[PDB]
Design an enzyme around this catalytic site. Structure first.
Site, short mmCIF file in Angstrom:
data_model
loop_
_atom_site.label_atom_id
_atom_site.label_comp_id
_atom_site.label_asym_id
_atom_site.label_seq_id
_atom_site.Cartn_x
_atom_site.Cartn_y
_atom_site.Cartn_z
N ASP A 107 0.87 -1.19 0.00
CA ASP A 107 0.00 0.00 0.00
C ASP A 107 0.91 1.25 0.00
OD1 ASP A 107 -2.88 1.02 0.31
OD2 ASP A 107 -1.89 1.86 2.04
N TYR A 236 -1.18 11.30 2.49
CA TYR A 236 -2.10 11.67 1.38
C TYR A 236 -1.91 13.15 1.01
CZ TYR A 236 -4.64 7.27 2.08
OH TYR A 236 -4.96 5.96 2.21
N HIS A 294 -7.57 -5.88 -0.69
CA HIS A 294 -6.55 -4.86 -0.36
C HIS A 294 -5.61 -5.38 0.72
CE1 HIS A 294 -4.37 -1.35 0.15
NE2 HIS A 294 -4.81 -1.15 1.38
C1 LIG Z 1 -1.29 4.09 -7.16
C2 LIG Z 1 -1.42 4.62 -5.74
C3 LIG Z 1 -0.21 5.43 -5.27
C4 LIG Z 1 -0.18 5.61 -3.74
C5 LIG Z 1 -1.41 5.09 -3.03
C6 LIG Z 1 -2.63 5.75 -3.15
C7 LIG Z 1 -3.71 5.41 -2.35
C8 LIG Z 1 -3.59 4.40 -1.39
C9 LIG Z 1 -4.70 4.13 -0.43
O1 LIG Z 1 -5.65 4.90 -0.34
N1 LIG Z 1 -4.60 3.05 0.33
C10 LIG Z 1 -5.56 2.75 1.38
C11 LIG Z 1 -6.70 1.88 0.90
C12 LIG Z 1 -6.52 1.06 -0.21
C13 LIG Z 1 -7.52 0.21 -0.66
C14 LIG Z 1 -8.73 0.18 0.00
O2 LIG Z 1 -9.57 -0.82 -0.44
C15 LIG Z 1 -10.78 -1.04 0.28
C16 LIG Z 1 -8.95 1.02 1.09
C17 LIG Z 1 -7.94 1.86 1.56
C18 LIG Z 1 -8.22 2.67 2.80
F1 LIG Z 1 -9.37 2.35 3.37
F2 LIG Z 1 -8.28 3.99 2.55
F3 LIG Z 1 -7.29 2.50 3.74
C19 LIG Z 1 -2.37 3.73 -1.29
C20 LIG Z 1 -1.31 4.06 -2.11
C21 LIG Z 1 -0.18 6.78 -5.95
O3 LIG Z 1 -0.90 7.72 -5.61
O4 LIG Z 1 0.70 6.85 -6.91
#
Ligand SMILES: CC[C@H](Cc1ccc(C(=O)NCc2ccc(OC)cc2C(F)(F)F)cc1)C(=O)O
Ligand SMILES: CC[C@H](Cc1ccc(C(=O)NCc2ccc(OC)cc2C(F)(F)F)cc1)C(=O)O
EC number: 3.3.2.10
Lengths: 317, 318
Positions: A107, A236, A294
């Site tokens: 993640d 973020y 995830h």
């Molecule tokens: C391609 C993504 C990357 C970095 C990146 C961007 C977003 C996230 C992110 O929101 N992770 C948390 C997450 C992921 C999946 C989920 O599925 C239910 C839920 C979550 C969360 F609930 F927010 F924690 C994790 C990494 C970028 O922005 O380049």
């Protein structure tokens, strides 16, 4: 698969900067492997990998990433830009007297280990990401442009205070709500910006995912009481800094041994997004876990373990 | 030789039982080496070895032994018998997921690593003692016999809980400036202690600073011993009968693992002679010997210690 009792682990602490200490859990002997959890998780997320990688012949360091658990949560938003976060991990290696490590991330932790491998390859013996692709920054494409509207929820995460209040409201609710198999999912990440919340249209007293016990949920709960969700959320809140930093590498490939592990049922970090990473990463090997959402580590611990040890023993040892 | 800044070390903590955590400092990668300081010292005593062993290609764990520094100091005297101390180090390895370590000890630390090597050889890749010999317990010779059989009379002064604590806790700067001296700088007679009724009673009020050591370095020791004081440390002396009866239960059995005895010409307590017949009891014993070296071997002669340890490590243990 053998898990971890927190009370029985060796706890490690390293000041990487005046008021910033990194906590890690350490198990085993042999090549150093450094596990970097995602949002909003913990070293404990690696509870099924740690015992297995140690048994496989590896020295495992399972981080509380900065903002989490027993690692410092400095109050400044800009402390959680990838630049700072990566320099601080390099300082982590320096202080432990490690010339390099294998970096394995999931993640947000996956994005850190991609960027370690990009800018500090001399310190990264090999790199592996769970779910998270390595997509190079388009310098013609700003981040606010890129929000792939699956990622609209990132806008709700922007305003400091707002998402903190939702997520800190009821910690048991938060974690029971998040830590679910994709089939158990109670929230839509696509909807978040509209509804004005992750949880606003999800159960009041959510039930317990098959992935997790009450006790495991209460550990997460207990950790996030320490510093809350601001630190974690601040990952973020550095899109512009991260974008401008990543552009300053633009074009250069990652020539070190690499592993991308995709999860069929991560609806945010979808397998497809990783599709053309070979162009940017000549020596990339691939794993892919079916029926995995995830929360890859605790969804499919035995699969993760078999993929990582196979690649470790072939590409890193 | 490069030293250690405490603030810049990785600090490690391991609960080996409910109210008992061991603290250690960790540096480097490769085979696990576990440095066990003596009385009344600290992980910091290894400050000149730790950077050099790490550089040499070793993963160094520099303990606060039980009673010291950031390691728990449980109040019970029998918690510091060798039996318990060794079981707890084995539990230390278990919790770190180490199948074995190289154990390097000095002084009381040296006695621990001999006894690890005797009773837990499967967990000890190889063993080295600075100054401290391995003399097997004679089951016909009680401990109180061995002492007043004489340089070791001071061990009797150390017996009564409270007594030696008061002398040594009186003035911590005095204590450490007084102890941490080259043998030519010595202000104590260890052989006199039982008579005079004190270590320091016939030694300077404001002692001078040994050439071995800076003010900063002394103030670190001082700062550490404020945490638990001298009871824990001293309780290693207060298990002679338990240690004797335990060690007799090994009687006869040799130490077949790779071993190193390092003698210091000018340790007048742990004298080179005492180590003379350790070959009979330890077939695979290699030897070092540092000239012009007193008790405080690590800080007296850091470069000598480093060259002997790394030579033996690289040849016998890696
Ligand atoms: C391609 C993504 C990357 C970095 C990146 C961007 C977003 C996230 C992110 O929101 N992770 C948390 C997450 C992921 C999946 C989920 O599925 C239910 C839920 C979550 C969360 F609930 F927010 F924690 C994790 C990494 C970028 O922005 O380049
Ligand atoms: C041969 C000795 C061993 C165990 C053993 C016995 C005594 C000591 C001991 O008193 N060490 C501390 C010491 C040693 C030499 C000294 O020279 C100046 C001074 C000290 C002291 F000041 F007490 F810390 C350390 C270990 C045994 O009993 O078999």
């Amino acid at each position: 698969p053998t898990s971890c009792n927190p009370s029985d682990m060796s706890h490690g602490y390293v000041t990487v900067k005046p008021r910033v200490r990194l906590h890690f859990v350490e198990l085993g002997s042999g090549p150093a492997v450094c596990l970097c959890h995602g949002f909003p998780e913990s070293w404990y997320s690696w509870r099924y990998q740690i015992p297995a990688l140690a048994q496989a012949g590896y020295r495992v360091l399972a981080m509380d990433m900065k903002g989490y658990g027993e690692s410092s949560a400095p109050p400044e938003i800009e402390e959680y830009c990838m630049e700072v976060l990566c320099k601080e991990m390099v300082t982590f290696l320096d202080k432990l007297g490690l010339s390099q490590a294998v970096f394995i991330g999931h993640d947000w932790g996956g994005m850190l280990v991609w960027y370690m491998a990009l800018f500090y390859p001399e310190r990264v013996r090999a790199v592996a990401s769970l779910n998270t692709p390595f997509i190079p920054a388009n310098p013609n494409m700003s981040p606010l442009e890129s929000i792939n509207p699956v990622f609209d929820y990132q806008l709700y995460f922007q305003e400091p205070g707002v998402a903190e209040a939702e997520l800190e409201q009821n910690l048991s609710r938060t974690f029971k709500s998040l830590f679910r198999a994709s089939d158990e999912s109670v929230l839509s990440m696509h909807k978040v910006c509209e509804a004005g919340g992750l949880f606003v249209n999800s159960p009041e007293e959510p039930s317990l995912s098959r992935m997790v016990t009450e006790e495991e949920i209460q550990f997460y709960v207990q950790q996030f009481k320490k510093s809350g969700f601001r630190g974690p959320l601040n990952w973020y809140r550095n899109m512009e800094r991260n974008w401008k930093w990543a552009c300053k590498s633009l074009g250069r490939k990652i020539l070190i041994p690499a592993l991308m592990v995709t999860a069929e049922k991560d609806f945010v970090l979808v397998p497809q997004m990783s599709q053309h990473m070979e162009d940017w990463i000549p020596h990339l090997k691939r794993g892919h876990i079916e029926d995995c959402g995830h929360w890859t580590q605790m969804d499919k611990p035995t699969e993760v373990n078999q993929i990582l040890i196979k690649w470790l023993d072939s590409d890193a040892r």
